[model samples]
Target chain A: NVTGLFKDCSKVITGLHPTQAPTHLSVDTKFKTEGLCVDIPGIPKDMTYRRLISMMGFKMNYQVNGYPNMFITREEAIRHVRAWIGFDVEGCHATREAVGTNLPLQLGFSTGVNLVAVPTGYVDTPNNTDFSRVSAKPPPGDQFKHLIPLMYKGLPWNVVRIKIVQMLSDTLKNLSDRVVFVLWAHGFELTSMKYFVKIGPERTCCLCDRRATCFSTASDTYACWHHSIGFDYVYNPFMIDVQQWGFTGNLQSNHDLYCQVHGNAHVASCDAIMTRCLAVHECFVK
Target chain B: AGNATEVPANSTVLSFCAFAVDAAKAYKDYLASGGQPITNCVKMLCTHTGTGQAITVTPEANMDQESFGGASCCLYCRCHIDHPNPKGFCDLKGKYVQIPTTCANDPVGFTLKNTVCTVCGMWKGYGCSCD
Candidate 1:
């Protein structure tokens, strides 16, 4: 599932080479919390919903050691995801014929990495050197514009409130059919042949070119400048690249979640992946 | 009645402020107006427009915000300024005039509000009043 989402996705799918065939990994819980809210250490209590997911990407990157390509080849990343979560993956891919064709392992993949980034509040400190100063005036001149966004986090609460509701609805949709429903809800459509492909990509505007296609490289954004303004004639990468795994480049959602789990100083701690990677290297050996 | 002048639209109507001072000479003319001559006073709620509305405000020195806005919602005809020398409570007529507050406990009563909110864009302390 993660392979189709990450490894096979177009954004990260550049021309590839290399090998790998290992068991899938699950995301295991290193900690727990009250029955209602899921409490992961690094996540802040006051963090916005969108911010939380974007941060999750950072945690995954941290686990992968910045080398996403190696783990990309193994295919066990998704398996590792499930295994990390304590889910069993034996019956799904077990025969000699299924060996080479089945999905590879994603060694060090993060579970939450698709969230988007949003603005946060401003941090203003007065010019202490000037005695006549009252409250810190906005930083002088042209920089005053910069202070605007900093003072107001970009994503409107109305938008986030809608998203929270969508999440609940999606969760409810999942209750009816399990995997099939999740796939469809996430834009994947299944066929009678038992093979599933994503029907479309959600939340993207057609007017916007999804994979950074424009004049300047301000930054590697998913949508093109024209499309970023909200275009109507574009196609979604989700459906276009479904044949491959992990079709989209790393999304802000997963990053946000990873940040929630490990970004905060309050809750970060060592876990199995780190322990396993550390075990491979013999510190005492010559 | 025949000599009545037309009221100006969208122009400020000054009351209690000194009629003799030419903008810069407010304090001098203010002393001549028979009104208490003072530099600054605590902001007090002139009125509460409606419910579900929050007001962001700063109160006078020594007095807390809840003590700022006048007790009755539509009371207090006072303004605030950057005063070098400030006096506490002062009585005008039978009603006591204090400072302005966005809170409900203020003579106008005060409720804590987030910094992001504002009342009519012109905060309570921005305008000065006298009557």
Candidate 2:
């Protein structure tokens, strides 16, 4: 059923070469429009494999000198395109599907809060208009190390959930049967990559006072180590009934939901409730 | 196994080891003492060396071990063996010998213990003892 949605899309005969021109193709226009190109399911109807790749190539080369082919293979290009589309489609659709049907929320299936590092290049801080360069290559041997916080200010929480869902989906596919998801994120510095969590103002931990380990859009909550046992131990229950689900409430209220469903036997601490809340957010395809 | 002592030194270093005829001997001792026999490359530490750094050595035949010198023991190198003079008339003895050699990719100027070499000596003078 899932694969059928992609049936209209045709297989590439001789895959597009790095040097091949997308616009000046000699293939049938119908194939170009319908056969080979597949319209991504949930995105704005027009976004296709050809459009994103071509536009990205045009923009990348136009702004700075770089080759798209150098960065990825045709298979990878396809996978990335699928990943982008899949995130949006699955994000919004899964949320809507879960809300409509009787599926219990499984929260901890995805990651928590992370602080990603912006690229290290000089940007025109004054020029915030469209198409301004984010950063530039500093002089050789110059110790120009400055990092900025990566924020998702413009996009709604729903959009962010889609991204998290897509990443979780990708990770889930890699994991074999009978396992739980492990989540982590890191910041990239000059010549070295280090682990750093998002902390400070809006970025706070959901479980404890230290620092928020993860942020979730479903309940609009940020998790912290103070509350999360993380992958260290399995405190969260693997199975939950969506019929009795009540994940979108205050901590005390949600704790009461757990007390009602799971009873007071395991409801000794806040971490138990926090982990339970995380477990209730997972959405299974079957 | 696990026999290391801290010896005070003024511009000095300390190391330790248990002598064995071969890696099998070391492994046999390990098994006799309730340790598991390592089929793959098992990282063993030269306790004699104060650093306690480990080197991957195997007990199987022809799998060589590097020498950390100074009373350190490895099955590949004969550091534990006494000086030899090809004793007796003809001696009529056969020995499975392992020669020292460096890995092709091994960079220059670093300690040569872990690199390919069968000699029981430290990596010194930019040359491996097996060389």
Candidate 3:
């Protein structure tokens, strides 16, 4: 009945790095929430849930920086399944869901932290604060040089994990799966735009086939072609901006409730994928 | 009377800084309000009295801020403002503040804690120890 519980379509064997799937470690791909614990189960008592969570937090350099989207959690996925299956032998249901789902979603994803420029112009964060307007641009150059490559490099994944957890937790259950997937996928794509463009005597488009041109005249300095061809435009893939989920600690329960009410385990699978996925997260960091 | 570094003909002196005992003390004030941080565009002049070779300093403002992590218009603006080792300088066009030097009275100018530090290079050029 357990194996029979999952839909055949959702259970495909995505290779370690499926072109469709990303590269990641356990607990890497899945988004986590307040109740979620992405570690492997059956550890000794020395590693309590609190301790494991704390360790993971330290490993990831966890902190909140207002990125919006998803709400499911590995812990909630397991706990909910346990409630239905009961704490006796049925608690195994919770364990299975945790291993199979949440981890992949949290860790498997990668977003591009790029270095972009705009003729000394301005842009806005989700909070509407402009990164360009700071009195102290990170030392070397403009805003582009400061945050690019540094903001996400060598940053212990545990730190990035907290954001993933919030995203999964804040999203509505009905919309969580697709919303989370799209938001995470695009974070990598859009930010990569900056990397694709190089600044010098002239602005060059790395993605384009044309040779680099010098910005000799004032008229040549607007949103260059480098700015236009987004990854979606190049790859012909859908670019989704999943609305950021509100983090109020209700995420895990909501995901659990949805799974319970609908009798669908796809949510668990999605979470598993998140926790395990991580093909090129450190591409820029490296 | 002094050693003069050669200057190519038509080389416009963009900026300069004097290598003197009170050089840094002579240049340190800034424009806090209004757009554009003053560190980037301030024009500095460095001329040795013996040799007229003007060593002008036109620091790229953004580079200075990012390199120093100091955006305040004054060195006296730090957390330990009261105990400035060599104090700050504020004397350039449009008002500007030079970063404080970590090394105070060494003969070899001054060096900062980190390599590739502009404040370190600047402080040393102004007669503070950057070593």
RMSD of each: 29.2, 27.0, 25.9
**lDDT tens digits, residue span B8-95, model 1:** 1101111211111122233223333332322111233223232212222222222222212211121111211111113322122112
> Judged by DockQ, which candidate is best?
3
Off by over 4 Å in 2: A1-178, A181-254, A257-259, A266-278, A281-286, B1-113, B116-120, B124-126
User: How much is B83 displaced in model 1, in angstroms?
Assistant: 28
Q: When only chain A is evaluated, what TM-score does every model earn?
A: 0.16, 0.18, 0.17
The lDDT ranking, best first, is: 2, 3, 1
TM-score of each: 0.16, 0.17, 0.18
Give the docking tier of candidate 3.
incorrect
**Candidate 3 lDDT for residue B35:** 16
Predicted structure with the largest lDDT when compared to the true one: 2
> Candidates' DockQ values?
0.01, 0.01, 0.02
In model 1, which regions exceed 4 Å deviation? A1-113, A122-158, A173-286, B1-131
Instruction: Give one digit per residue, the lDDT tens place, for model 3 in A1-286.
Output: 0111111111122211100010111111232224321222232111111000000000111111221111234333333321110000000001211112111111222221111222111111111111121111222345224233332232232333233333322332223221222333233223221112112222233545432321211233322223331111111111222223332333234334224332322232332222212211111123
Across A1-286, the per-residue lDDT of candidate 1 in tens digits comes to: 1222111111111111000000011111221123111213243221111100000000111111111111122233322222121011100111221111111111111122111113211111110011111111123355234333332232332333233223322332223211111111112111100111111112232344233211111222223323333221111111111113342332223324223333321100112122222212211123
**Model 3 spans > 4 angstroms off:** A1-204, A207-248, A257-286, B1-131
Q: Return whichever of 1 and 3 wins on lDDT.
A: 3
Model 2 over residues A192-234: C-alpha lDDT tens digits?
A: 1001111112233454454333434235465432343221111
